[PDB]
Write a protein that binds this ligand. Structure first.
Ligand code: UUM
Ligand code: UUM
Ligand code: UUM
Ligand code: UUM
Lengths: 265, 263
């Protein structure tokens, strides 16, 4: 991978692995999400982060995901090369945004796009806060100054408000627990595991006859490594749409909410 | 990746990913096992496969009986690891796939692995010995003189593993596979079982020790709607005896041993 000519974005090529594909011999949405995080991490590393800035480390501040939105037109096949381009942008004092564009390396055609919203949080108290001027200035030298959006459209799906699923759910998958492979180097649950957990309550017949086109996921609280999660799904809809809810198995505390759009094969 | 000059082995380089590493910022044993499977699949693809022409005609498949991995150094995040793999026929008992892991910068061996595979009818699930026709089709891609990742006589890779006796010292109960744990054929990936075994090791051992050797026997498959219990007992460096069994009837799916060195 490498930063582009202007140094305001980063590109990386990936060869789709045997264990990374599902029943159709194409990459799963979880493989796609892992590749997005890997290119994001390589971009941060290339511009001097380790994505905490100097001011963030001084004040015990970290970036946490608030929302992930992914739209896939074509999933790459096993052995195919996918090229991903990524960049960041400051959204004033609200937080930051990281965008991605996925392309077929052979045809050069856009096969997917993604966007994510990040908020500042104190690592110890877990208290959200606005972005300060000092942090904003350190981030701006690595971001394009004119807006560059993966989802530019007027009333686009990436910014839609998601409602809370009402009990009883149509479908559910109960007692989901993370294992060591689900944790990151800091022993926190990887953001991609939550996408997997959401998808667990989709019936196997929908997965067998449809392809996932769009997923929007809101992140409210973290799942600890000793927590247990219940995944709830209700059909809201040629296309199938679902409303999702992840909550702790015990007290029913919300950890995530989301929506998925599926197209018949 | 590519087949070597003689065409009897295959090499591939991998850059260790951010999500592939644990608390020490080095690859997990599960990342290592996934890379072993990936280079194995790329080798089979390069030589025309891992079912052969005779196997497809008779509804036959290769199934793992045993996996043995020894790691001297786990590669760090961003490091490049080179893996070399090759296959060998073991008469009519089955086949063996071996691996050598190296640091791409130093050229030093950082790990080695070996696996035993048995023939099975994919419909009846009945094991069988390798026939002459299949043996002949495999031999043109394997070295004819023995080449072993673990050549030493009476070594760890061939040791008989006993069955853990109840009560276990430690346990992790109610483990279930999710869709990410399945392969393209909707079967549980062999690497998931390694993860499940390791789940019953206490976090303090993981935090203060590095895993040096893991030997795992595969007895029966876990279906996607099955639930597993992972059991561990200290037998000792720290050594453990492991057992994976179904949560309901207690049917054995795996047994194994792990050896850990203090950091
Ligand atoms: C899915 C998905 C994407 C990311 C992501 O961008 N992660 C990131 C960006 N910069 N750094 C240092 C890490 N995490 O989960
Ligand atoms: C607001 C708000 C809180 C959280 C939160 O703690 N959850 C979480 C899960 N993974 N990451 C990186 C953060 N996210 O948004
Ligand atoms: C761990 C581990 C290694 C393998 C392995 O070699 N898999 C293999 C070999 N040939 N093909 C086509 C697949 N499976 O799990
Ligand atoms: C003898 C014998 C049977 C099995 C078996 O069915 N288990 C299993 C799990 N994953 N694979 C590929 C096979 N293993 O050894």
């Amino acid at each position: 991978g490498s930063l582009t000519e202007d140094g305001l974005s980063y590109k990386e090529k990936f060869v789709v692995r045997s264990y990374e594909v599902g029943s159709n011999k194409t990459a799963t949405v979880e493989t796609i999400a892992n590749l997005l995080q890997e290119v994001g991490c390589n971009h941060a590393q290339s511009v001097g982060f380790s994505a905490t800035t100097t001011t963030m480390r001084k004040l015990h501040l970290i970036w946490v995901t608030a929302r992930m939105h992914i739209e896939i037109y074509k999933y790459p096949a096993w052995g195919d090369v996918v090229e991903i381009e990524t960049w960041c942008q400051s959204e004033g004092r609200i937080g930051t945004r990281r965008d991605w564009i996925l392309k077929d390396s052979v045809t050069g055609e856009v096969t997917g796009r993604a966007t994510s919203k990040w908020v500042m949080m104190n690592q110890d108290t877990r208290r959200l806060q606005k972005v300060s001027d000092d942090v904003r200035d350190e981030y701006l030298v690595f971001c394009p100054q004119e807006p560059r959006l993966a989802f530019p459209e007027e009333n686009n799906r990436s910014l839609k408000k998601i409602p809370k699923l009402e009990d009883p759910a149509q479908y559910s998958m109960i007692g989901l627990k993370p294992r060591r492979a689900d944790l990151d180097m800091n022993q926190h649950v990887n953001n991609v595991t939550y996408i997997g957990w959401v998808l667990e309550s989709i019936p196997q017949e929908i997965v067998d006859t449809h392809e996932l086109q769009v997923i929007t996921l809101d992140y409210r609280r973290e799942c600890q490594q000793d927590d247990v999660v219940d995944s709830l799904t209700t059909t809201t809809s040629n296309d199938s749409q679902f409303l999702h809810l992840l909550r702790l198995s015990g007290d029913g505390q919300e950890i995530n909410r989301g929506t998925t759009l599926w197209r018949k094969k």
